[PDB]
Amino acid sequence: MKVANIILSYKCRNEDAQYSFIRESVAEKLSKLADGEKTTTEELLVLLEEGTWNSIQQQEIKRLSSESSSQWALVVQFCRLHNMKLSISYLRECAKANDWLQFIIHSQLHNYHPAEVKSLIQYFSPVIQDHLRLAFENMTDLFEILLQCSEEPDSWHWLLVEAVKQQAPILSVLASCLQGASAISCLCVWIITSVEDNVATEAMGHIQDSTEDHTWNLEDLSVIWRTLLTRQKSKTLIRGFQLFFKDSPLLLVMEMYELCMFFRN
Amino acid sequence: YLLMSASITELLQMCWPSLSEDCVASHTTLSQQLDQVLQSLREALELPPLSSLVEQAAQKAPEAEAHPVQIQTQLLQKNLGKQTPSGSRQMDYLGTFFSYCSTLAAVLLQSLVEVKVGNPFVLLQQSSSQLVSHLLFERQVPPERLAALLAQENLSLSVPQVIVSCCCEPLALCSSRQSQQTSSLLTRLGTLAQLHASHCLLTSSALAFLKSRSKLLATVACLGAEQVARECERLLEQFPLFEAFLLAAWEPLRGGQSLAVNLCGWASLSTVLLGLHSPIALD
């Protein structure tokens, strides 16, 4: 009864029609809702919110004062009563306006489920936003990705797992500098994360496990080596083998390959 | 009860919870109390950050016990519970947010015995990083006691991540402005190639904590005066395989001096660590 009654204003004082046809339409929609039409239920509640906003405006008061919530209670009342997801009605309407002592209280006295409050927290401001996301907690910056890399098992996998995903190559070199990283491993990460897209992808076919569970060994470099040399691109290997494992002979065995088949002297 | 509070079809279609004997006046009293509280609440709370907290901490303890904000704080903290459902676990949001503007005030005041925690909703004026920055640099605090205290409250300000991004550098690592800039560089250099080949015929003391934790995040921190160069010298000397991708990356952009006295201070040292991953890479 309260829902149908409150639906009057922004269906009659906003639309021009005979009230009887409106009544018939509303009755049809009501019987439809009785059938548990979730979509129709959502539409009906949406209209309820719209008309409620109109009515709130009509009373000529602040759109988010105390009596505002007093009239707004029915908004939660309906949604809960009909077993529909608690709609984010006035939480946002206060969120954009930077008024915390409404997003605290009115968050509270209806039991706003903890996912929604945090999820909608990202509307306030620069300030009173960091004091709030951390308030009840319970990357893309090299000064951060490495600052928060003192937390893993040791290190030798968080940095590599984070750097294989986003194509970067000034992280792997730091990765193979902390105490306990397999020097013959990070080479796979560099040479696979400093090439083009298709080259970086089609070479990955040798892998079987997922991204964070594929500890490299002295075997994956084999397919990496072969894939890189096929479809000519050698100034990358002839380049990595200097940062990593040094003048050891494989470097020269590949250094021949620049003076021949590319440079021809 | 309706008539007395004021002092059929009028009523049996309103929407209080149930028409039981008490619930009507119960809700009336609860709503009226919450409103009469929150009104005076906003009134009081509508009334320098560190300076203001310092001053509020200089009064007498009996005076501080009567903080108007605190005075109504427990009133509302209890009204919310007394006006709410029963049997369902009400997550005490007001408590959680009161703790974070109480405990942080306490720590940021103590690090500056005991302390009279006055009006605590005065530090919500500025953001998180700003406060730690002000305390760390301005009022001569040592960047170890603070990182010690914040440990024993279960917080996450990250006393290193607030000192690095206030005096060091804007190093950024995107991933989509690389494949959208290779196809731009390949064109701009080509246009600059044809039209030129067709011519064919104090200086910080937080280095203490910085070096204390994870020396790598001290080397990269340095690379972002002559004393700074001197620190970089040794701190990179202890690292063999990093100064190879900083000298096979410094020649084909500028060329004397030393391998560190040239970079650490110039915009030659922020397009070189990262590759094409920079806003100012192209120029």
Curated annotation (Swiss-Prot), chain A:
Q: Where in the cell is it found?
A: Cytoplasm, Cytosol; Nucleus; Cell projection, Axon; Cell projection, Dendrite
Q: In which tissues is it expressed?
A: Expressed in all structures of brain, with a high expression in cerebellum. Expressed in cortical projection neurons.
Quaternary form? Interacts with AP5Z1, AP5B1, AP5S1 and ZFYVE26.
**Task of the protein:** May play a role in neurite plasticity by maintaining cytoskeleton stability and regulating synaptic vesicle transport.
Pathology noted in the record is: Spastic paraplegia 11, autosomal recessive: A form of spastic paraplegia, a neurodegenerative disorder characterized by a slow, gradual, progressive weakness and spasticity of the lower limbs. Rate of progression and the severity of symptoms are quite variable. Initial symptoms may include difficulty with balance, weakness and stiffness in the legs, muscle spasms, and dragging the toes when walking. In some forms of the disorder, bladder symptoms (such as incontinence) may appear, or the weakness and stiffness may spread to other parts of the body. Amyotrophic lateral sclerosis 5, juvenile: A form of amyotrophic lateral sclerosis, a neurodegenerative disorder affecting upper motor neurons in the brain and lower motor neurons in the brain stem and spinal cord, resulting in fatal paralysis. Sensory abnormalities are absent. The pathologic hallmarks of the disease include pallor of the corticospinal tract due to loss of motor neurons, presence of ubiquitin-positive inclusions within surviving motor neurons, and deposition of pathologic aggregates.
Protein name as it appears in the record: Spatacsin
The gene that this protein is the product of is: SPG11
Part of the full-length chain shown: 1272 to 1564 of 2443
Swiss-Prot record, chain B:
Subunit info? Interacts with AP5Z1, AP5B1, AP5S1 and SPG11. Interacts with TTC19 and KIF13A.
- Can you name this protein? Zinc finger FYVE domain-containing protein 26
Q: What does UniProt note about where in the body, tissue by tissue, this protein is expressed?
A: Strongest expression in the adrenal gland, bone marrow, adult brain, fetal brain, lung, placenta, prostate, skeletal muscle, testis, thymus, and retina. Intermediate levels are detected in other structures, including the spinal cord.
* Organism for this UniProt entry: Homo sapiens
TM spans (from-to): none
Q: Which disease is it linked to?
A: Spastic paraplegia 15, autosomal recessive: A form of spastic paraplegia, a neurodegenerative disorder characterized by a slow, gradual, progressive weakness and spasticity of the lower limbs. Rate of progression and the severity of symptoms are quite variable. Initial symptoms may include difficulty with balance, weakness and stiffness in the legs, muscle spasms, and dragging the toes when walking. In some forms of the disorder, bladder symptoms (such as incontinence) may appear, or the weakness and stiffness may spread to other parts of the body.
- Highest lineage ranks of the organism? Eukaryota, Metazoa, Chordata, Craniata, Vertebrata
Function, in words? Phosphatidylinositol 3-phosphate-binding protein required for the abscission step in cytokinesis: recruited to the midbody during cytokinesis and acts as a regulator of abscission. May also be required for efficient homologous recombination DNA double-strand break repair.
- Record's subcellular location: Cytoplasm, Cytoskeleton, Microtubule organizing center, Centrosome; Midbody
Q: What does the comment on domains in this protein's record state?
A: The FYVE-type zinc finger mediates binding to phosphatidylinositol 3-phosphate and recruitment to the midbody during cytokinesis.
The source's superkingdom equals: Eukaryota
